[PDB]
């Protein structure tokens, strides 16, 4: 053929891939974390937006730390041979490096490690997108006038 | 012939390191609101980083917190794009 360039990811596999949305709204009372009013609006917005991008969306609601880890383990071990990419959206409380299950924290590294180039061969060389709506600390940006 | 195991991840953070992230109980979070609008408007036209750059500007310019508590009133937010991607990403083909 003619000259070719390899500057973009192959996005024309039979499927665009999974879009896992974890929508954590209500937290076990013993944690002392407040309900995240409005996150259902986020969850439905994301579901529709990625539906139209032709992602296979799975909405999960109010998962424990254990359920988040298991879901990530299970999803990583699925057959991604026909999938272009992977998207995981996390909606929860958090702090730097951490997001919360309904019953306690999960290290972000623990979640993303399931998809490492060597631990998830189904996705090696394929874009893995983590979209994280969660606090990263307690600092407030006072902004500056323009 | 090998690639790093950390390659080909992108982390679209709603807020800068160390900071709160703002959520509106009626409208949804500032970040997710803006991300969905920019995806809808530009996913058939722009590369992913350039979409996410529009999300940054939208969150940075169009949103400001309102609170009866002086500590939390009038605050701003910038999201944080973290890319270990090795290629450009277009949602179309």
């Amino acid at each position: 053929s003619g000259i070719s360039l390899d500057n973009s990811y192959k996005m024309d596999y039979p499927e665009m891939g999974l879009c896992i949305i974890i929508n954590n709204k209500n937290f076990h009372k013993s944690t002392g974390m407040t309900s995240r009013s409005g996150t259902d609006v986020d969850a439905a917005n994301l579901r529709e937006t990625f539906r139209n991008l032709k992602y296979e969306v799975r909405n999960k609601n109010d998962l424990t730390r254990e359920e988040i880890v298991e879901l990530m383990r299970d999803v990583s071990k699925e057959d991604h041979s026909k999938r272009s990419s992977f998207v995981c959206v996390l909606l929860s409380h958090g702090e730097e490096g951490i997001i919360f299950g309904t019953n306690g924290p999960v290290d972000l590294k623990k979640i993303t490690n399931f998809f490492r180039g060597d631990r998830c061969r189904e996705l090696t060389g394929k874009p893995k997108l983590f979209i994280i709506q969660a606090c990263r600390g307690t600092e407030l940006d006072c902004g500056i006038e323009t | 012939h090998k690639i790093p195991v950390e390659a080909d991840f992108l982390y679209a953070y709603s807020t800068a390191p160390g900071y709160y992230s703002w959520r509106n109980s009626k409208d949804g979070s500032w970040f997710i609101q803006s991300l969905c609008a920019m995806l809808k408007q530009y996913a058939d036209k722009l590369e992913f980083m350039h979409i996410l750059t529009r999300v940054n500007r939208k969150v940075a310019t169009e949103f400001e917190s309102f609170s009866f508590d002086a500590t939390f009133h009038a605050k701003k937010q910038i999201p944080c794009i973290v890319s270990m991607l090795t290629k450009e990403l277009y949602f179309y083909h």
Partner: peptide, 4 residues
């Protein structure tokens, strides 16, 4: 406007 709420924080998380």
């Amino acid at each position: 406007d709420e924080v998380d």
